[PDB]
Amino acid sequence: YINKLEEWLGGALFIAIFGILIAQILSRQVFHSPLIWSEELAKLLFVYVGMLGISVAVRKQEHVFIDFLTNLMPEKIRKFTNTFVQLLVFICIFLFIHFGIRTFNGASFPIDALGGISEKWIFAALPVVAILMMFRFIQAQTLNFKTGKSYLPATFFIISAVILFAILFFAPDWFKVLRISNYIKLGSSSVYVALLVWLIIMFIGVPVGWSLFIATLLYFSMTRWNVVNAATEKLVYSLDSFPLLAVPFYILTGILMNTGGITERIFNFAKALLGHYTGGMGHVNIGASLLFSGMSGSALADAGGLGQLEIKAMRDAGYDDDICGGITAASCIIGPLVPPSIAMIIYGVIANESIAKLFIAGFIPGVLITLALMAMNYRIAKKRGYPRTPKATREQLCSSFKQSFWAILTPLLIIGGIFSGLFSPTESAIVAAAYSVIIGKFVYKELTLKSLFNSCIEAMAITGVVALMIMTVTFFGDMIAREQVAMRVADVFVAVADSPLTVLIMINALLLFLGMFIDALALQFLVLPMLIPIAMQFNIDLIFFGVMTTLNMMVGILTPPMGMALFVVARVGNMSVSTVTKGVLPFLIPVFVTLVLITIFPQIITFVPNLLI
Amino acid sequence: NKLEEWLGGALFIAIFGILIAQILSRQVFHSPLIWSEELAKLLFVYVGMLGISVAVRKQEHVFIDFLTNLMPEKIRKFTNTFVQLLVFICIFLFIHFGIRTFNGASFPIDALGGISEKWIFAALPVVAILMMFRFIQAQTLNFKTGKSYLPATFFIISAVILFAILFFAPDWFKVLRISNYIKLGSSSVYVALLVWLIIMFIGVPVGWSLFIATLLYFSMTRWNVVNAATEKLVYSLDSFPLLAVPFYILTGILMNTGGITERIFNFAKALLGHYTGGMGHVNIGASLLFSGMSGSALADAGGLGQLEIKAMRDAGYDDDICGGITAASCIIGPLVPPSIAMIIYGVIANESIAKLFIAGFIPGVLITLALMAMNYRIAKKRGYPRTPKATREQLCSSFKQSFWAILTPLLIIGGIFSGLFSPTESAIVAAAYSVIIGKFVYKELTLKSLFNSCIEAMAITGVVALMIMTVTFFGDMIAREQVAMRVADVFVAVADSPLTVLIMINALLLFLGMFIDALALQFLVLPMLIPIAMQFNIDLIFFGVMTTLNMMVGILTPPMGMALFVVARVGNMSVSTVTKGVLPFLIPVFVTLVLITIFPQIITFVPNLLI
Ligand code: NA
Ligand code: NA
């Protein structure tokens, strides 16, 4: 029809990348005859895949935005706010089109190890998909206006776009009027003004992926506009990255492993293993979450794939509702810590750090979290005197292990690939996806071509949202580093640079405070760009800083009044949010304790990666 | 699966806008552009490819169905299987030739900032792959309905193995060259022509039969020449005069609205409705006025037929007379400019289109006058009654109602004749005026209707584009083998007078027009007669007008004619009565044709004086 054209085309390109990578590994490992074009071809296709994902997201209106202030507004103000955000997004898309055309015209360098092919093939992705994004925005405007959620029809946008394109193509010297330098010369306060405007527009519902672009454009307009052409290439260059390839494949691996059949087998094995100790079903839940974390890079999937079973088992065992909710909500944070992890990949991409070292560093805190949660569950259960389930016979344990053998072999594969160094994170993700597909198709007989295509489509759709923010934050970093914001901030914060512990304490406190009202995914892209240079200023190790920031932000999904884990657990378990929060409250002590422990003693985190690499 | 329709319609409106900027800048701003024509051609190539793909998907390519209508279904199974296999081979070779030609072309375009010709030449394999996919999709339904013995999976595996062999072992193809076994020699072209006639009469579409015939001839002698010959396949569509066809078709479709046609009929009835035999005069005049805009006879037959038939029946006419008049009055369309057939002839023979239009204007008027005289005589002899004469108020109201409708033919004719606009520019202006009138003046136009009209125009132009490219490919072999010189050496005895050649050609065309449709017959006949006509020092404009008239004659001849069937369908009467009523009206057409072929000066004088 006329909406699935990006999903039909994007899905086909996703399959092509999978076939190319699997051929690269087979040739190197088996035949010892490596290929020189696989990486470049994969990155070239991934650029288009990411652009198509962005188009899908902007069509479905699914871009991340802060809704804390938006949730406390009568609709009569929401109408004006939505009108403003629609205008801002339209302007951003038009400027994307202009900059993509210009940077495609400017591409000159050839691509070696690809037959001398010019770089215009890479650089042409931006305008062709920006046109589709503009079409999708115009299409969505009709639905927005018809229901009374905005003030402007799509005819207004069509007329404005036609007029703007005609002006841009027939007299581009008319746009020099709207330069702030022509009226007021702020000087060195341009960065502060741009950041203030960025915060103001971000707090009123504008998505971050456009807010960063708007802030950077305002800064450039204030000082000088001719320096934007040099910096605009980073938008295309950010997607042309090898480490960024692992995100969609890890997402697809999690999606494929999150079927009902595999989860039931894993939970049955865990229950047969840890079901008869003091605090049985709590230990069962913790163990199941730990096992799932080795193959899943997200916490919401773990929360939504096992809650209805773990909560029921705990209720049958003799557990109160608050305890069930607390354990279920607390056990979710293990996922993002144990590798693989989307948050660690994002931090490594932003800070230009090796993902493997981040994974190795973050492996230990997951084990510490698991042990602390198990100890707390045992103490609570012993205090309350809950009954003990009968011991399982050896035959049932053996049968459950035989059933779940191939399902549980995956985390071992991931850890062996990563720790031993035989594979890179992207190759590890590719191997994991191939193994999961084989297991689903031939061993469990629970997969179909339609299901595989739908999983690929979902992975691309969730990848596009991250891709837009990645490219925009890469654009924002140039503005941040050009004017030396971090150096000035450090100079202002004098007499506190004596001890790095004070800086770490302040950063942790700020992150904890901000995590109570902003979702983790948005908070990461909101706070990292201005903190990474500041951390670099104080000679703070970047691997330890990344681990600490990831843990601190993952803590924030458990604290009221805004926490996704609390809402998900309450919805799944059919219980009120207040009871879930009350049950969660006693379980926040171990996480704070381990956070303080790693903050005081960085050697715990730093020892393992140094020994291994 | 509207993937081609959605993308093709987007390109169609892009072409329309670019052409508009060309004429406006050149007229009032006096700042002509240097890239509008190049962009128009470059986009028209893709538009034609998309139309061909759509036609392949819908299985609507033209073919001869005379012998196919006289055989049992058992034979039809084998015939359809053979046709499917031949089309599959044609599409595969199409893909291969597109890839080779794209990998060969390197020349730049100086009129577009040095852009390489690869941009033009890459449109062949990209759309060829989509055509192959559409054929595979249609094969499933063909096998499901029981019309063929070959399922789709067989085609899939055959395509896979063929692609693998081509990419990894092209040298294995050296066993299918006829030069391996026997060297036919000079008679290779004759053998290829015999195979072409047979494969056409079997039921293969023309646009593929010509390709098969020329490929067989090339493989008969040397396969290394087809590499040089394959550039014409893409260069054929890269033509600016060819752009007039889709826009004229769109203009006709837009103007064929029921509201406009009702007003035109009302004005014609108020004007010429009271004379003896008034209804026939009204029918002829309305057909002439609508042919001033349209360029197809089928629109004339199917649009205004019911109202004219009802008016004639009310007046007290007979069924045979009304049917005959309605059928015979539809041939004025292709004669009066604009006309699709004249454009096709000009493209094939490389002749000016404005000269063709000017030359062909007069015979349409002669036909109209002859038909009016014949109708008047028949009505007077049969003693039909007379209608009262309308008063000045009715005629003035009709004029005020249909002013904007009758403006368009005069605008088009004035643009063509005065030399102010080229035929493509005239088509663009006509389309713009029609859409403006529809949207704002009469208020019966919607954006969805415009998109549907554009889709229909693209679908109907793809079929013509495929035949155009294939016939241009065929002409290469025809010219290389020196067929016309051999034919002249054979019929040296016929060269006594050019009148003998003309009457022989006319008789052959008249005999061939009783079984084949006008379009298929034209595409079969023109490539073989144009070089022969040039051989005998025969003028090409006069020959084109005469051939167009002779081909248009065949649509009113039994046992095959589209006009008879359409008139019978829309008139609720048997085909036999329609034929027996048409028969007395064929005399003026034959008389006009004989008069034209006797005095070519009648056709020749007007364009030379007008130029
Ligand atoms: Na994980
Ligand atoms: Na006409």
Author numbering:
A (entry chain A): 3 to 615
B (entry chain B): 5 to 615
Q: What does the literature reporting this entry say, word for word?
A:
Tripartite ATP-independent periplasmic (TRAP) transporters are secondary-active transporters that receive their substrates via a soluble-binding protein to move bioorganic acids across bacterial or archaeal cell membranes. SiaP delivers Neu5Ac to the SiaQM TRAP transporter, which uses a Na+ electrochemical gradient to drive transport. The SiaPQM system from H. influenzae has fused Q- and M-subunits and is one of the best characterised TRAP systems to date, with key functional and biophysical studies informing a putative transport mechanism driven by a Na+ gradient. We determined the homodimeric (2QM) structure of HiSiaQM using single-particle cryo-electron microscopy, the first structure of a fused TRAP transporter at near atomic resolution (2.99 Å, with local resolution extending to ~2.2 Å), which reveals new details of the transport mechanism.
Dimeric HiSiaQM exists either as a side-by-side parallel dimer where both monomers face the same way, or an antiparallel dimer where one monomer is rotated around the dimer interface 180° relative to the other. Dimerisation is mediated by the same interface in both of these structures but given that HiSiaP is found in the periplasm and SiaQM requires SiaP to function, the parallel dimer is almost certainly the physiologically relevant conformation. The maps are of high resolution (overall 2.99 Å for the antiparallel dimer and 3.36 Å for the parallel dimer, FSC = 0.143 criterion) with both extending to 2.2 Å at the core, allowing for accurate fitting of helices and (almost) all side chains. When refined using dimeric masks, the parallel dimer has slightly lower resolution at the dimer interface (scaffold region) compared to the antiparallel dimer. Local refinement of each monomer within the parallel dimer improved the resolution at the scaffold region, suggesting this is perhaps a relatively dynamic interface. The buried interface area is small (~200 Å2) for the antiparallel configuration, and even smaller (~100 Å2) for the parallel configuration. Further still, the parallel interface area is formed by a small number of residues at the N-termini, which have modest resolution. The predicted binding mode does allow two HiSiaP proteins to bind the parallel HiSiaQM dimer without significant steric clashes and each monomer has the same binding mode as the PpSiaPQM model. The parallel dimer is consistent with other elevator transporters, although the interface between the monomers is reduced. Even with a small interface, a dimeric HiSiaQM assembly may further stabilise the scaffold of the two monomeric units.
